[PDB]
Design a protein around this nucleic acid. Structure first.
Lengths: 122, 92, 72, 54, 50
RNA sequence: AAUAAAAUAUUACUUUGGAUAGUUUAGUUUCCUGGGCGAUGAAGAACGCAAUGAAUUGCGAUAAGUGAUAGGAACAAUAAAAUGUGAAUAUCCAAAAUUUGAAUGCUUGAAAGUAUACUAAGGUAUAUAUGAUAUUCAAUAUCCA
RNA sequence: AAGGUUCCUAAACAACAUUACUUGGAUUAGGGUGAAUCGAUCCUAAAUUACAGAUGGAAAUCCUUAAGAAA
RNA sequence: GAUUCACGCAGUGUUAACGUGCAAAUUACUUGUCAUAUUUGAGUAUAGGGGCGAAAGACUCAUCGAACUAUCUAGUAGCUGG
RNA sequence: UGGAAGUAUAAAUCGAAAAGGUGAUAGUAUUCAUCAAAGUCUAAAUAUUACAGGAAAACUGAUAGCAAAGAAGUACUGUGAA
RNA sequence: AGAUUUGAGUAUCGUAAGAGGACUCCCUUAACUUAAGCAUAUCAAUAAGGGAAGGAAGAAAAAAUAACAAUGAUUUCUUAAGUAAUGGCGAAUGAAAAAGAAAAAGACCAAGUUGAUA
């Protein structure tokens, strides 16, 4: 695995596209070499190159999604791929504010008649 | 002696065994302790009346009831709206 | 001729591979699967077939997503 | 286990087959089929009165 | 048959691919018991029933 | 009358067989904590992916693994390459996640397919029932110029 | 139709084809199936199955153009 | 819906062969029949107190005077064996 | 249903109120006692052999213990359920 | 033309489905078995079939017990108790108040009133 993720991050978007085309073409010729009787050093190169494409594609996708998250951070209608991670049950449950809601009659009574602190002498 | 044993049904699915009993004590005791730490006068087991038992078989004995009637609170000069907040049971 | 001789013409499949359960239990003329009860939305399970429940149910497969959720 | 040794659909073959009347495993294609069944003296069957947790 | 559906043909090819033995190098691994593939079948011995 | 080839009996050694003894990375039962799936596509099924893999394991066209954070020098059956400028290994994280499956554009037998709209090829949306809002309509159904 | 690699070649004969086999539809490793015109795909036959509707305590059943602001 | 031969098909007789078979119903000769109430492939429809039957309680996957499979179920046994 | 001249539910018919229900032997009357139906919500004490993670054992020790101590619901059988 | 009522098509934002069902709430008129036969009864809210749920669920604040020197929502445990009762009064089935504990908590709609009414 020789792509040096530190170097991928410094590259620009077009450079990533240009590099991805170079890697894919180089990998394609290495598939030919293995079939046509390649050397073990060539075969080990084939395994290595496959990891750069996975490494290279991850950075492009991660950066693109991160930019999208910033774009839709203030948006009213966020795409479902960018909403907070929950389960189906969690979405359906009432909000904590809704659960604790009380009527004005009960809210004012609890204000005027709270649970006192006391103790019994023995 | 004529035997009367009701084992003709599937008692094997009706058997309840008490292997959880030594751990009910630990559960209830720990929760009972947890209540005292949180707000102590809640596990205080708020005050309850002294009411006679029913029927002539028991009527000479006294036992704790549930809640003081509204007339007993007035005689003791306690508001019923304040009684529930200071560990007094009230039973209208 | 109810034995050896009658088995000469057995060259017409009744059941073919199903699509939801993957077994050779799709009845062609009946247009239903005898095992997973296809067309039917609910998977076919019976309380008398307790073994057929343990042969195909939750946890007998990959659990590709549920294994992450339960551990979460 | 409450269901240990009782997880077969076996029935006795009956008489007229030169074999005992202890129940036998159904089906074919394996060595298990046609063997003994739930009976206490058979192999891979339930024992005598099974020990209960109660 | 000579005539087959596309999906059925691929499931025929996989059954061909799975009818192979253990490679020799796998048999030399430390603590290896997998010497023979007991899921093997031959056309004249067992019908795969598909 | 005679023979010990066969036959029989005992012990030693060898053989077919796997009992017995020693042992356990497996089970059984009870108890404690939770009981955390799915249209944001679940459980299940199918196919594919390792330098040499058939099963199994892990994974999804970024393939027995990618990024990030911890982690500190290995793996090995055989070669290679990479490696303290960070190998293995771990994960409730990030990206990614093929064909199906409630399966949900229409069709589906073992079926290969295919229509419209938006952004040639690719990718999205379009099943049924249903709540609120908006818009377009229908019926002199009630009045009504 | 059914079978599913049994097809061709090479190496090799431990097992299998009631002796044996240098043979094999058996072991191992490779190779092999090319369509604008042949078929599937298209149409409909006996028949089959949907939305809405009707029926049922329920699962589900009936209806296939009749019941529908559908087709 | 005449008489016969042939490709085929059935199963009258030998109550032949075989009867730990070639075969969980077959073989040889003989006999009959061999196109319209004929023979036959595929598709399709009919399913358990149900179907189908030129009717034998026949056939419904070697299972039929009520199939196969699983649960009730370790059904009950004054009877037999240990 | 233990509820016995009807304890509960449902159907057909009938069908209240200037209230009324209950006091389990049907009926009428007069007192007594106790509640106030025909709408809704509500923590805690309670259950658990799905499943996941743990801890224990006068349990079994490869014909035993789960069917499964190895690629076990696997090899293999059946058109199929199994 | 206009003011309403009612019913549709489309668009937007969402909602139900399927898995699991050990424990929870229910629908349905099984039989083997016992009664030394058997036909009511028993097996038995039991098997199978079907629906719906959660981390628990169900129930819950008296048209409730009792006849007392009276209690006081619900739930669960002990006792009452194999008792009252039911039953070819045969085989068999069978509770509850009282009393002792674990825990404790009460609040709303409808109807009525206020209407320069919101």
């Amino acid at each position: 695995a020789s792509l040096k993720i530190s170097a991928i991050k410094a590259m620009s978007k077009n450079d990533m596209n240009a590099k991805l085309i170079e890697l894919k073409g180089e990998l394609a010729n290495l598939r030919t070499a293995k079939v046509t009787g390649g050397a073990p050093s060539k075969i080990s190169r084939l395994r290595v190159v496959k990891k750069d494409i996975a490494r290279l594609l991850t950075v492009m996708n991660t950066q693109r999604m991160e930019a999208l998250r910033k774009y839709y951070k203030q948006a009213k209608y966020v795409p479902k791929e960018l909403r907070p991670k929950t389960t189906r049950k969690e979405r359906r449950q009432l909000t904590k504010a809704q659960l604790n809601l009380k009527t004005v009659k009960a809210a004012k009574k609890a204000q005027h008649f709270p649970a006192r602190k006391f103790f019994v002498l023995a | 002696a004529v035997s009367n044993i009701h084992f003709c049904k599937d008692w094997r699915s009706k058997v309840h065994t008490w292997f959880k009993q030594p751990f009910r004590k630990i559960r209830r005791h720990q929760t009972r302790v947890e209540k005292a730490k949180a707000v102590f006068p809640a596990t205080i087991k708020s005050l309850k009346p002294s009411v006679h038992c029913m029927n002539q078989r028991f009527n000479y004995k006294l036992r704790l009831g549930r809640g003081f009637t509204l007339k007993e609170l007035r005689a003791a000069k306690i508001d019923k709206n304040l009684a529930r907040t200071i560990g007094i049971a009230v039973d209208p | 001729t109810k034995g050896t001789s009658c088995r000469g013409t057995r060259h017409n499949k009744t059941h073919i591979l199903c699509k939801r359960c993957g077994k050779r239990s799709w009845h062609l003329q009946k247009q239903r699967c005898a095992s997973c009860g296809y067309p039917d939305a609910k998977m076919r399970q019976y309380a008398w077939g307790y073994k057929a429940l343990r042969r195909r149910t939750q946890g007998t497969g990959r659990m590709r997503h549920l294994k992450i959720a339960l551990k979460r | 286990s409450t269901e240990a040794g009782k997880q077969h659909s076996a029935i006795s073959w009956g008489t007229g087959r030169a074999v005992a009347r202890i129940p036998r495993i159904s089906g074919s294609g394996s060595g298990r089929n046609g063997q003994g069944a739930f009976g206490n003296m058979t192999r891979k069957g339930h024992m005598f009165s099974p020990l209960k947790n109660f | 048959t000579g005539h087959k559906g596309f999906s059925y043909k691929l499931k025929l090819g996989k059954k061909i691919h799975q009818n192979r033995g253990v490679p020799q190098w796998f048999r030399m691994k430390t603590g290896n018991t997998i010497n023979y593939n007991f899921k093997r079948r031959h056309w004249n011995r067992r019908k795969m029933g598909m």
